[PDB]
RNA sequence: GAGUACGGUAGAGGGUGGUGGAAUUUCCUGUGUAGCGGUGAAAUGCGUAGAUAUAGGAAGGAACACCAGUGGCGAAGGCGACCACCUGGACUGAUACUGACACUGAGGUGCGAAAGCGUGGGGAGCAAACAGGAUUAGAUACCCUGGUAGUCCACGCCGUAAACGAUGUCGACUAGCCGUUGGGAUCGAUCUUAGUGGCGCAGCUAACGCGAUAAGUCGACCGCCUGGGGAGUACGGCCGCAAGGUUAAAACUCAAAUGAAUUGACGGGGGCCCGCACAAGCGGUGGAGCAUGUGGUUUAAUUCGAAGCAACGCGAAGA
């Protein structure tokens, strides 16, 4: 979420560095996850669906 | 009618889903001027585009140039569009970029967010 | 068309001037297949241009179309609940078509003795830009900046 | 079979105190100005009485991102900040010990999400009721701006849930393959245990499907069902402060109600493709006058028929 400037490179490489750092931080995901309250039933349902999708992907890898 | 000089101030971006607010202060956080996409004549649906963010940022920078401000430390806060528009648009006014920081407040557990929208 | 197999025919039958844009303007001004009527009307208009204008009339013609062609065009797209408009760069071939159509349709609305001297009047007006066709062109052009927000 | 003694592991298992950081809100102060907020678009609302952004400070409440996992623990409900104290159970290794001390269980006895009730506290965010602004034919809703009980704590009550694996507890047998949690043994591999998942042979099933975590093959005990409504309702009994809970009918009425799967049709489901279907253009109808057909009215008759696209210059290529 913060990057320094040094050694007079063009103001595009640092921009892509900042973008990459922000998307490594995952700020957008967390700020989207706080827009509305998710009741726990929906949370367990989403986690179960993600788990079954992940296991299906891993099985289909062979 | 008085006049004062300042160098190496800080510019701030509040980029929400509906608007973006660009302000300029000194290192002590005292406002000099400010620009808002609402006051530029965008009014809602147009208010959200990154182009309006660029316009507001460049207007704020041009207003800041009167006091000098050869250096600018910029904070951005909020997930709205134009999170990157203002960063590029500030150089259009001829400013030296010293640090770009993201200060989006992340609740750890905190209060509870409002109810889900049923649309 | 979904298939996109429809090729285009090429027309080049300039009688005496041996140009290209002239014939397409002929087709634009031609109405109900009156090709010879279009011949004589446009040639009388060009004669009036030549007697009024010191230089040759073809470069005046192309300069007039240079000041009527719109660089960008606005086109409505509905976002699914709101009626927006989007500015887009005009296709290079489409520029000449818009130029010719606008110039003809604006020369049609003068109201003087005939449309030969109407065509001459807007050909000289568009030669620098004090006509009404240039007025519509600049209005459409400025609508783009009026809607630059969406663009993408 | 069951249990006891002895070492070692893992865990959001329970209870009582203390302590953390982030974030929201409110209040105070500083420069600075005219907008902020919100939406599909708006408006209500907040605004030079200086907001949001921003800097500094103060109080207060609640939840514990990242770890985090088909992961773990608990009889079930359920249990995620860190630390100490009190405490229950499970897993694992060898030896000794008790010598059937077991399983199930009508009655009864407890624990039991959320909402709710009583007394006393607290109250930041959220949010039934409610107020206003929208949308609409209406909108006592969905959407937006606020907002009270409640959500938080102590004690007491209430006994309910799609309280679900819609699958009672206990025990013994029956091909295999790929994960994973936490322990052992042998030489990364193999072997063996208690869980936790995905496939799958026999076998079972109306079918779906289950398949060593059986819905297979068998035993022990218990609970429950007998067409759909009426109805988990009435009356009586027993509980509760109340809300209500539990046990639990009949008259009357119908010839069905129901489960799984199949073909088609449909969808404000999805994916590909086509057509003057849109889009890009040109010229029209709807406005005026007249021709011609039809509907309606009148008449003695205005002779019959054709009626969304697929009737109306149509049978009629001649009243
Ligand atoms: Mg909201
Ligand atoms: Mg403030
Ligand atoms: Mg028992
Ligand atoms: Mg009993
Ligand atoms: Mg009991
Ligand atoms: Mg409760
Ligand atoms: Mg209470
Ligand atoms: Mg109270
Ligand atoms: Mg509301
Ligand atoms: Mg009440
Ligand atoms: Mg029940
Ligand atoms: Mg449960
Ligand atoms: Mg049941
Ligand atoms: Mg068994
Ligand atoms: Mg299977
Ligand atoms: Mg069965
Ligand atoms: Mg019956
Ligand atoms: Mg009852
Ligand atoms: Mg009773
Ligand atoms: Mg279909
Ligand atoms: Mg069209
Ligand atoms: Mg007509
Ligand atoms: Mg008419
Ligand atoms: Mg008839
Ligand atoms: Mg016809």
Query: For the residues of chain A, what is the DSSP string, one character each?
Result: -EEE--S---TTHHHHHHHHHHHHHTHHHHHHHTSS---HHHHHHHHHHHHHHHHHHHHHT-
Q: How far apart are CA C145 and CA B13, in angstroms?
A: 25
Using only C-alpha atoms, chain C has a radius of gyration, in whole angstroms, of 18
Could you tell me if B97 and B90 are in contact, meaning their C-beta atoms sit under 8 angstroms apart? yes
Q: Does C149 touch chain B (CB under 8 A)?
A: yes
Q: Is C18 exposed, middle or buried (0-12, 13-18, 19+ CB in 10 A)?
A: exposed
For B74, the 3-state DSSP assignment is strand
Contacts 24+ apart (CB under 8 A), C144-151: C144/C72, C144/C73, C144/C74, C144/C87, C147/C74, C147/C84, C147/C85, C147/C86, C147/C87, C148/B51, C148/C87, C149/B42, C149/B46, C149/B49, C149/B51, C149/B52, C150/B49, C150/C84, C150/C85, C150/C86, C150/C87, C151/B51, C151/C86, C151/C87
> CB-hemisphere CA count at 13 Å for C14?
11
Q: How far apart are CA C102 and CA C47, in angstroms?
A: 22
Could you tell me if C147 and C88 are in contact, meaning their C-beta atoms sit under 8 angstroms apart? no
Q: Does C27 touch chain B (CB under 8 A)?
A: no
Q: How far apart are CA C111 and CA C109, in angstroms?
A: 6
* Assigned token pair, C72: 């960008």
* Assigned token pair, B111: 């209060």
Characterize B75-91 residue by residue with b for buried, 16 or more Cβ atoms within 10 angstroms of its Cβ, and e for exposed: bbbbbbbbbbbbbbbbe
User: What secondary structure does DSSP assign to C41-102, as a single string?
Assistant: HHHHHHHHHHHHSSS-HHHHHHHHHHTT--SEEEE--B-SSSB--EEEEPPHHHHHHHHHHH
Residue B91 CB in 7 A reach of strand D: no
Could you tell me if C101 and C93 are in contact, meaning their C-beta atoms sit under 8 angstroms apart? no
Q: Please tell me the distance in Å from B8's CA to the nearest CA on chain C.
A: 32
Could you tell me if C46 and C15 are in contact, meaning their C-beta atoms sit under 8 angstroms apart? no
Residues linked to residue C111 through DSSP beta bridges, in sequence order: none
Q: How far apart are CA C32 and CA C25, in angstroms?
A: 15
Residue numbers preceding breaks in chain A (C to N > 2.5 A):
none
Residue B31 CB in 7 A reach of strand D: yes
> CB-hemisphere CA count at 13 Å for B70?
2
C39 sits in which H/E element: helix C35-52
Q: How far apart are CA B64 and CA B58, in angstroms?
A: 10
Chains near A with 3+ CB pairs less than 8 A apart are B
Q: Please tell me the distance in Å from B32's CA to the nearest CA on chain A.
A: 24
Residue C74 phi, psi dihedral angles, 5° rounding: -95, 145
Q: Which residues contact C68 (CB under 8 A, 6 or more apart)?
A: C99, C102, C103, C126, C133, C134, C137
Query: CA C106 – C1' D279 distance (Å)?
Result: 25
Residues linked to residue C89 through DSSP beta bridges, in sequence order: C72
Q: How far apart are CA B10 and CA B25, in angstroms?
A: 5
* Residue C148 DSSP one-character state: T
Q: Which residues contact C134 (CB under 8 A, 6 or more apart)?
A: C67, C68, C125, C126
Q: How far apart are CA C88 and CA C73, in angstroms?
A: 6
Q: How was this structure determined?
A: cryo-EM
Q: Which residue, among B2, B12, B18, B8, has the nearest Cα to B33 in the 3D structure? A: B12
In terms of phi and psi (left: phi > 0; alpha: psi -120 to 50; beta: otherwise), the region of C72 is beta
Residue C72 phi, psi dihedral angles, 5° rounding: -130, 155
For B24, the 3-state DSSP assignment is strand
For B33, the 3-state DSSP assignment is strand
Spell out which residues of B between 42 and 81 contact strand D, using CB within 7 Å: 43-45, 47, 75, 77
C36 sits in which H/E element: helix C35-52
Q: Which nucleotides of D are covered by protein (CB under 7 A)?
A: 20-24, 30-42, 51-55, 61-65, 69-70, 124-127, 142-144, 197-198, 273-278, 280-283
Q: Which residue, among B12, B52, B55, B56, has the nearest Cα to B36 in the 3D structure? A: B56
Residue B119 CB in 7 A reach of strand D: yes
Q: Which residues contact B7 (CB under 8 A, 6 or more apart)?
A: B68, B69, B70, B71
A52 alpha carbon – ligand 14 mean position (Å): 28
C124: how many CB neighbours lie within 10 A of its CB? Answer: 18
Q: Does C80 touch chain B (CB under 8 A)?
A: no
Could you tell me if C124 and C133 are in contact, meaning their C-beta atoms sit under 8 angstroms apart? no
Q: Is C68 exposed, middle or buried (0-12, 13-18, 19+ CB in 10 A)?
A: buried
B20 sits in which H/E element: strand B20-25
What's this structure's resolution in Å?
2.7
Q: Which residues contact C35 (CB under 8 A, 6 or more apart)?
A: C26
Q: How far apart are CA A37 and CA A40, in angstroms?
A: 9
* Assigned token pair, B96: 């030296």
**Cα-Cα-Cα-Cα dihedral sign, residues B85, B89, B91, B97:** negative
B77 alpha carbon – ligand 16 mean position (Å): 61
For B102, the 3-state DSSP assignment is strand
């Amino acid at each position: 979420p913060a990057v320094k400037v040094k050694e007079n490179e063009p103001f595009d490489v640092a921009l892509r560095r900042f973008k990459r750092s922000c998307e490594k931080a995952g700020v957008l995901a967390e700020v989207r996850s706080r827009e509305f309250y998710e009741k726990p039933t929906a949370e367990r349902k989403r986690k179960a669906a993600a788990a079954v999708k992940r296991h299906a992907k891993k099985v289909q890898r062979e | 009618k008085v006049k004062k000089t300042v160098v190496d101030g800080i510019a701030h971006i509040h980029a929400s889903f509906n608007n973006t607010i660009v302000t300029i202060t000194d290192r002590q956080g005292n406002a000099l001027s400010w620009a808002t996409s609402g006051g530029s004549g965008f009014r809602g649906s147009r208010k959200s585009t990154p182009f309006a963010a660029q316009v507001a940022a460049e207007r704020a920078g041009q207003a800041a140039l009167e006091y000098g401000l050869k250096n600018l430390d910029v904070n951005v806060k909020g997930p709205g569009p134009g999170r990157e528009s203002a960063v590029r648009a500030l150089n259009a006014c001829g400013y030296k970029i010293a640090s770009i920081t993201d200060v989006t407040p992340i609740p750890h557990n905190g209060c509870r967010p409002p109810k889900k929208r049923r649309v | 068309p979904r298939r996109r197999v429809a090729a285009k025919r090429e027309v080049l039958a300039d009688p005496k001037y041996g140009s290209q844009i002239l014939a397409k303007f002929m087709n634009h001004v031609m109405e109900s297949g009156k090709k010879a009527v279009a011949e004589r009307i446009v040639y009388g208009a060009l004669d009036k241009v030549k007697e009024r204008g010191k230089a040759d009339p073809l470069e005046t013609f192309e300069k007039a179309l240079d000041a009527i062609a719109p660089l960008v065009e606005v086109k409505s797209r509905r976002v699914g609940g709101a009626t927006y408009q989007v500015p887009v760069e005009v296709r290079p071939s489409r520029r000449n078509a818009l130029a010719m159509r606008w110039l003809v349709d604006f020369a049609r609305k003068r109201g003087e003795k005939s449309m030969a001297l109407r065509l001459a009047g807007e050909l000289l007006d568009a030669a620098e830009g004090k006509g009404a066709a240039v007025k519509k062109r600049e209005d459409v052009h400025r609508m783009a900046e009026a809607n630059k927000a969406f663009s993408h």
